[PDB]
């Protein structure tokens, strides 16, 4: 039975193929058909291109050899190469035009998700051109989704040499009949077929995937839309900054470009942004996904006042100072959403742009105590339940698996009634001991949250709700201000507490505010509608944040 | 006796002052003298500018108020403001022209080095302009050198209000006669003088520093050139990436911009780059200063083969992959310098540019065993001493303080003779039990190295020298290649092992190679000549790396 799938890069995982561009170049320059492909392969195993593919020479060293082969071929064909003929320009364009064949990558991803060991086996070169970063980015984006990447120029062997196929089998630790091998070059399929591997000649992707689906018995075509790439905690770069003697902030970091600081809500983790992290980094941003103070690997001091907005914001500024960042885009959700609005109001110089998911910006009312304000809306009753130190900690810490499975549910998955939490004696008094698992999470994702919360529990997280008076006094200082830096408010149709209507008067305070709105989306925006969150965030970042 | 020094920002730590630019603007526009400064201060404590300085409103909210005050003042003076008059353009230019007053900052730095608590006390605003990042960068660069930053718009008080001076004294935890206060605004000096603080009216920097030097009894003028800013380990962002199950790599991270990966030598630390980290980040780079494999907080597996160049380079590639970096500039010193040349030869797509301090690029000789090659040059005898597992570990681990004090010495500080190490029975057989401290390091810096080496000792570090045959075979694969990506070789005049002459034939392999050369510089380049290293590296990064 098949357990491994091997894909070629050029003409399989990336389109168009180099041969295709050489063919299009020949036509545009009115050169004899096959002239450039002949010069490219000239000398066969003894030729310049085999030396390049085996890593003997670099791409810049190969360019004049390809030039001479083109002159030699033109001379024999009794044709003239044009006056401006340039192998460097021809190849720069061919490499630059290449894009990931998204349906092929999705099929590779589906097979790995079903237990297949996947690999990329490619005839490639040591690219030392000034423009090499283009290819470097393409390889990075592709390679992360595979168990192995075998490159001809790193192993000193090329397809169709029998040895590279033996090297592949040794790397896979699989026998030939357990492997399916996809290639757009027929001659490169022959040695894999000779060993007894299942082989697919890729012309059009749809037919290649049809053959792959039939042979594996795994559906690869006509599948439901896949979710964005997630994060494996053990594969991330974990960063740690001490903001003050007893406070260290943990974050996960991915990508290059402008700094984008992700701020989770209650009771969450940097892991709540798992579907956003890879997508934002791929979009050209340096993502900093925080464990907010009181959570995960960040410090969790016991004192209530350590969690007031003024203290938390000052620490986020120190966090930037210590990392040597003049600014970051701040994106927040729930309590994180509140923090980012305050970051925009008090430290606009340090905030490149601000975005909130679900949490509206509501000015403090100087004529009413925040306790009275919270009492006015029945959906906020849970916030009063959270006031008494120890009460909510006991209930939430009792059974962590039950806590997360009861909380992390989509809007149509029998969500907890937020009505009369105090009167009922707790959040889970009408909830089962063993809740069903939401479609939004796997059992392993729930256990990740359970492990994170075993470190510090719910004291620090709950203290975020215990500074109403202190936060109100500090917010009153900002009442004459407006938020005039780039801002985005994203409402979720089915968030029954942070209702879209609560955001209705935001333009009075944030006149240039941009909006996003997600239909059929509950409170847990990032994991409920990850693809939609990603599209909204990336479109806004690219237009308003740089 | 004085123990604290307080500096104003505008006209003291940053030049020119806003008042100065308003004055120059008045002249250029042929407006009445003082018209703009009058409009700026209009209404005094009740005015628009006091509201702005107290954080009541942001800079963008204030701009139309300043416009109206300019119209009101022009009307009363019976003059016309020009057709294109723009407060936004006037202020953007004034803020943008402001640069750090380097002699004032150096004096502040010298005072803090002598035990003074230092602070910045400023009448400032909440800057929400599109161009705010300029000011954000200036504040970041300045604030890091001080114990405190007190900003009017964050405390809701302004100079010359008596309360802000009481707030200052409370923050300093100092009595008025213990404080020296520098300001370019006479009216803002009066309340500090009234409390009993020493006050200096800053006009020209030289005279202000003369008064400051006389009053503190600390030399601030005509001082020897200061060293670049260093790093406090506890103030850095510490990053951790698992490259494989048993291997994690630790790094320190600072700044934004293109990724610059710093690779130390033997027997060093990320801390060997302390004088480069702040300077490169200030120069607009994202610095990644590694603890190389076998060192500090990075993993130190016992196996020799874990430290061959092929394995180390593959791990550095995985390190980039996991951080989501397509490239980094690689800068190496000693063993790090060797690694970066191999990174350039084997993975040019991932290397933006390559630089080495002291370590030349020498191709492998396929006609001679590396053991024979090492035996040919007497200065490399210590490398043969390093071969036998356990021997050098015992000697180097015996007394860590003695190891580092004997090794870390400038070329004119009785450096160890590298001649006949094997025959002598060790590196320290002719060295004292208690070596004197080199002028390059403090006792506390030596103890930092002692603490780092107590974790894993010298096995992992020494294994870097125990892969001669394996590295030679792998390097032989690259013999047909040339390094064609941007490259810099920095030679040190007085490095008695890695002599400048050893780099003489590098152009045969790296034709476009750029060079740097440091006179009176020994092996420990980064700490021996930090200012010179910085100038060479920054000039090269800005011209050749982007
Ligand atoms: O729609 C919502 N908004 C929303 C907002 C907040 C919360 C809190 C309540 C206290 C514990 C942490 C989560 C829950 C929800 C729901 C309603 C209840 O089911 C989960 C989602
Ligand atoms: O000039 C040099 N180059 C240079 C190069 C390497 C080393 C090694 C030798 C083995 C232990 C680690 C350092 C020492 C030096 C010196 C000569 C000896 O004094 C220190 C500097």
């Amino acid at each position: 039975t098949l357990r491994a799938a091997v894909f070629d890069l050029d003409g399989v995982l990336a389109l168009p193929a180099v041969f295709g561009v050489l063919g299009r170049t020949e036509e545009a320059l009115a050169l004899p058909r096959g002239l450039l492909n002949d010069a490219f392969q000239k000398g066969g195993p003894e030729g310049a291109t085999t030396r390049l593919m085996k890593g003997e020479i670099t791409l810049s060293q190969w360019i004049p050899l390809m030039e001479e082969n083109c002159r030699k071929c033109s001379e024999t064909a009794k044709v003239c190469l044009p006056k401006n003929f340039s192998i460097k320009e021809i190849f720069d364009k061919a490499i630059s035009a290449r894009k990931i064949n998204r349906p092929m990558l999705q099929a590779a991803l589906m097979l790995r998700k079903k237990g297949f060991t996947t690999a990329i086996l490619t005839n490639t070169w040591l690219d030392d051109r000034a423009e090499r970063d283009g290819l470097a980015q393409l390889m990075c984006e592709l390679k992360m989704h595979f168990d192995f990447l075998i490159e001809s120029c790193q192993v000193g062997m090329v397809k169709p040499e029998p040895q590279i196929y033996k090297f592949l089998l040794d790397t896979l630790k699989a026998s030939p009949s357990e492997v399916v091998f996809l290639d757009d070059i027929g001659a490169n399929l022959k040695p894999a077929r000779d060993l007894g591997m299942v082989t697919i000649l890729v012309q059009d992707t749809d037919t290649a995937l049809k053959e792959l689906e039939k042979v594996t018995g795994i559906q690869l075509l006509n599948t439901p839309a896949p979710l964005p790439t997630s994060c494996n905690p053990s594969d991330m770069s974990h960063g740690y900054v001490t903001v003050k003697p007893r406070v260290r902030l943990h974050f996960v970091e991915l990508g290059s470009g402008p700094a984008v600081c992700l701020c989770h809500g209650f009771p969450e983790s940097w892991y709540s942004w798992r579907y956003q992290i890879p997508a934002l980094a791929q979009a050209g941003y340096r993502v900093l996904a925080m464990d907010m103070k009181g959570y995960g690997e960040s410090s969790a001091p016991p004192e209530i006042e350590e969690y007031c907005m003024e203290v938390l914001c000052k620490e986020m500024v120190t966090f930037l100072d210590k990392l040597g960042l003049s600014q970051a885009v701040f994106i927040g959700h729930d309590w994180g959403g509140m923090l980012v609005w305050y970051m925009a109001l008090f430290y606009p110089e340090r905030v490149r742009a601000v975005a909130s998911l679900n949490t509206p910006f509501i000015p403090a009312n100087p004529n009413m105590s925040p306790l009275e304000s919270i009492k006015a809306n029945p959906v906020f009753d849970y916030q009063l339940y959270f006031q008494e130190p120890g009460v909510a900690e006991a209930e939430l810490e009792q059974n962590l698996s039950r806590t997360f499975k009861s909380l992390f549910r989509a809007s149509d998955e029998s969500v907890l009634s937020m009505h009369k939490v105090c009167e009922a004696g707790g959040l889970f008094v009408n909830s089962p001991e063993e809740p069903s698992l939401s479609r939004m999470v796997t059992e392993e994702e729930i256990q990740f949250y359970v492990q994170q919360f075993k470190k510090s529990g719910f004291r620090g997280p709950l203290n975020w709700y215990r500074n109403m008076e202190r936060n109100w006094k500090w917010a009153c200082k900002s009442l004459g201000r407006k938020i005039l830096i780039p801002a985005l408010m994203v409402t979720a149709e089915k968030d029954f507490v942070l209702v879209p209507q609560m955001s209705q008067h935001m333009e009075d305070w944030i006149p240039h505010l941009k909006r996003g709105h997600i239909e059929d989306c509950g409170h847990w925006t990032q994991m409920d509608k990850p693809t939609e969150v990603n599209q909204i965030l990336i479109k806004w970042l690219d237009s308003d944040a740089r």
Side-chain angles (χ1 to χ4, degrees), chain A residues 89-138:
Chain A
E89 285 189 350
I90 289 160
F91 283 91
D92 281 354
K93 218 174 85 70
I95 296 156
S96 192
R98 228 157 59 163
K99 302 279 171 281
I100 285 173
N101 178 3
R102 303 282 170 188
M104 193 69 70
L105 176 61
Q106 288 305 329
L109 281 170
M110 178 63 70
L111 289 176
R112 200 174 174 209
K113 191 201 187 189
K114 297 293 189 283
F116 274 65
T117 295
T118 65
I120 304 175
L121 170 64
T122 176
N123 277 356
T124 201
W125 55 79
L126 300 170
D127 194 340
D128 58 352
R129 290 173 306 121
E131 309 73 13
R132 74 201 172 276
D133 190 48
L135 186 126
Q137 290 181 34
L138 186 238

Side-chain angles (χ1 to χ4, degrees), chain A residues 266-267 334 382 386 396 406-409 415-418 427 465 494-498 522-524:
Chain A
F266 173 98
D334 183 79
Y382 76 92
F386 285 7
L396 293 159
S406 298
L407 294 172
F408 301 171
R409 312 189 71 85
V415 297
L416 293 165
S417 82
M418 297 280 97
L427 288 162
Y465 293 93
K494 293 173 173 183
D495 185 328
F496 308 123
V497 170
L498 300 176
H523 186 252
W524 320 96

Side-chain angles (χ1 to χ4, degrees), chain A residues 13 21 38 40 100 122 247 267 302 343 360 376 470-471 476 480 490 506:
Chain A
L13 284 164
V21 194
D38 193 29
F40 189 78
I100 285 173
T122 176
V247 188
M343 288 296 291
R470 209 183 149 166
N471 297 342
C476 284
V490 186
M506 286 176 63

Side-chain angles (χ1 to χ4, degrees), chain A residues 72-88:
Chain A
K72 276 170 179 166
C73 291
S74 66
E75 166 182 276
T76 309
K78 289 177 170 79
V79 298
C80 295
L81 284 163
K83 172 228 283 161
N84 68 336
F85 184 77
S86 166
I87 285 301
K88 173 57 158 62

Side-chain angles (χ1 to χ4, degrees), chain A residues 253-257 260 276-287 538:
Chain A
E253 196 171 28
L254 187 74
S256 58
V260 177
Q276 282 70 53
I277 299 154
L280 296 174
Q282 192 52 231
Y285 297 89
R286 174 185 177 185
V287 182
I538 295 168

Side-chain angles (χ1 to χ4, degrees), chain A residues 64 111 116 177 183 319 333 461 525:
Chain A
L111 289 176
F116 274 65
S177 62
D183 204 307
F319 178 75
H333 169 254
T525 314

Side-chain angles (χ1 to χ4, degrees), chain A residues 342-361:
Chain A
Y342 276 107
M343 288 296 291
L345 274 168
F346 284 85
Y347 296 103
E349 306 97 334
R350 307 309 297 274
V351 182
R352 171 89 98 163
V354 58
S356 177
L357 310 179
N358 309 51
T359 314
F361 171 78

Side-chain angles (χ1 to χ4, degrees), chain A residues 52-56 122-127 149-158 164 167:
Chain A
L52 173 75
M53 298 304 194
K54 287 195 177 181
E56 289 181 43
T122 176
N123 277 356
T124 201
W125 55 79
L126 300 170
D127 194 340
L149 166 60
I150 303 161
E151 294 173 307
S152 65
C153 60
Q154 292 306 341
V155 299
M157 304 179 274
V158 293
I164 203 171
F167 184 87

